[PDB]
């Protein structure tokens, strides 16, 4: 009779940069998935598989909760068959996805004057990420023949860069907290 701790992931005090999509195995619990969308305090809740109500009526092996923070313009990129820096070099959804992408604005919580420069976005990776893959590597990027050998410099730039989250910024350039629900005996509704 345990209920799913979706709230534990959703209303989390502290999310995570996109380059480190945190994943919680929602498992062995009760999920009235409809009440999540009934919490229609959400900007984007589009379920590529089936509506929450229908799959509220359903069970899976496990449920995977992917939590991260991106910029508003890039909410589109957290979608199947989407091309973009976040999609290609940060978080990529399979072209065949059967889950729900959930998003809400967080300009209040994760913006500070001068900038919450504590959220990071990967700008350099030599090759597009495979579906549901995570790269935490901090090694210096080689844009040249010369090997860097660990010194930042020309043709040897640092991979992860940081969003500049200032409240005075535009809307599309504002913090948006995104939770991707993946659905693969445990969890019912």
């Amino acid at each position, epitope marked *: 009779t345990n209920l799913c701790p979706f709230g534990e992931v959703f209303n989390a005090t502290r999310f995570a940069s996109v380059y480190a999509w945190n994943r919680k195995r929602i498992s062995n619990c009760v999920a009235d998935y409809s009440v999540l969308y009934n919490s229609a305090s959400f900007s984007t809740f589009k379920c590529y598989g089936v509506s929450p109500t229908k799959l509220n009526d359903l069970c899976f092996t496990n449920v995977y909760a992917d939590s991260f923070v991106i910029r508003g*313009d890039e909410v589109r990129q957290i979608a199947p068959g989407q*091309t*973009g*820096k976040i*999609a*290609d*070099y940060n978080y990529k959804l399979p072209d065949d996805f059967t889950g729900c992408v959930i998003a809400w604005n967080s300009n209040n919580l994760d913006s500070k004057v001068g900038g919450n420069y504590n959220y990071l976005y990967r*700008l*350099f*990776r*030599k*090759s*597009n*990420l495979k579906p549901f893959e995570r790269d935490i590597s901090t090694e210096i*990027y*080689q*844009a*040249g*023949s*010369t090997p860097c050998n660990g010194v930042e410099g*020309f*043709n040897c*730039y*640092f991979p992860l*860069q940081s969003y*500049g989250f200032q409240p005075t*910024n*535009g809307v*599309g*350039y504002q913090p948006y907290r995104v939770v991707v629900l993946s659905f693969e005996a445990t969890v019912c509704g």
Partner: antibody, heavy 117, light 111 residues
Framework: VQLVESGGGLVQPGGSLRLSCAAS????????MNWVRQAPGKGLEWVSV???????YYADSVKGRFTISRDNSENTLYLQMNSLRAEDTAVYYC????????????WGQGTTVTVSS | PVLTQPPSASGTPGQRVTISCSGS????????VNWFQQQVPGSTPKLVI????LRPSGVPDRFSGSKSGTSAYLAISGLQSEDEADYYC???????????FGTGTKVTVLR
């Protein structure tokens, strides 16, 4: 640190041309890279960008008429131009768009494309 | 699609010429306005200012820039004899995934 544009010039309207930019010291497969053009006595126009891991973006003034690519094994990028028109008569520049950690550094000399009869 | 930028600019030697560049809230409001210099039409451009206001390497402390919403500016301080050129500004717009150049301003020193 050099990029040499090496395409062609004169093409009948509605024809096709292939442009190429040979790269020295910049790994074209890793660094974003980007084509820009300048019409005769006019401003600069972004044509296409490629990314390291693919995912091209094109300008609406070309879309299907133009395509961009990276030679595998060879340190050259290309712009295949087809269904060409007189508007496209310009000078074309390859360039290194380091998005934020730098900018559009390292521009090429430019190949001179003249679309006419 | 273009970024609006004046056609002409003028100044005596030693003066500071401040080039405009104004665009939409999806253009120059963010996504880093880049600034370019081109001596002659077919010339190879040269990045004077990048990521709004930062400078590359080999660029004089003379050149400088600032941002104010719908418009950012290029401050060519300490106006040299050579600096007379066509100057351009660029910025990325998610709205129509592209880079948006400027009309170009021709700085003209008078001496």
């Amino acid at each position: 640190v050099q990029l040499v544009e090496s395409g062609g010039g004169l093409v009948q309207p509605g024809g096709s041309l292939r442009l190429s930019c040979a790269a020295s010291e910049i790994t074209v497969s890793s660094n974003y890279m980007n084509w820009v053009r300048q019409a005769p006595g006019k401003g600069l126009e972004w044509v296409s960008v490629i990314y390291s891991g693919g995912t091209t973006y094109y300008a609406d003034s070309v879309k299907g008429r133009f395509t961009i690519s990276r030679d595998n094994s060879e340190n050259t990028l290309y712009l295949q131009m087809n269904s060409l028109r007189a508007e496209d008569t310009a000078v074309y520049y390859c360039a290194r768009d380091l998005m934020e950690v730098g900018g559009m550094d390292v521009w090429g000399q430019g190949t001179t494309v003249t679309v006419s009869s | 699609p273009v970024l609006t930028q004046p056609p002409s600019a003028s100044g005596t030697p030693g003066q500071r010429v401040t080039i405009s560049c104004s665009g939409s809230s999806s253009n120059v409001e963010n996504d880093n306005v880049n600034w370019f210099q081109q001596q002659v039409p077919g010339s190879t451009p040269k990045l004077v200012i990048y990521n709004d206001r930062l400078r590359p390497s080999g660029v004089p402390d003379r050149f400088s820039g600032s941002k104010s919403g719908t418009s950012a500016y290029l401050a060519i301080s300490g106006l040299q004899s050579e600096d007379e050129a066509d100057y351009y500004c660029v910025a990325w717009d998610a709205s129509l995934q592209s880079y948006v150049f400027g009309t170009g301003t021709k700085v003209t020193v008078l001496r």
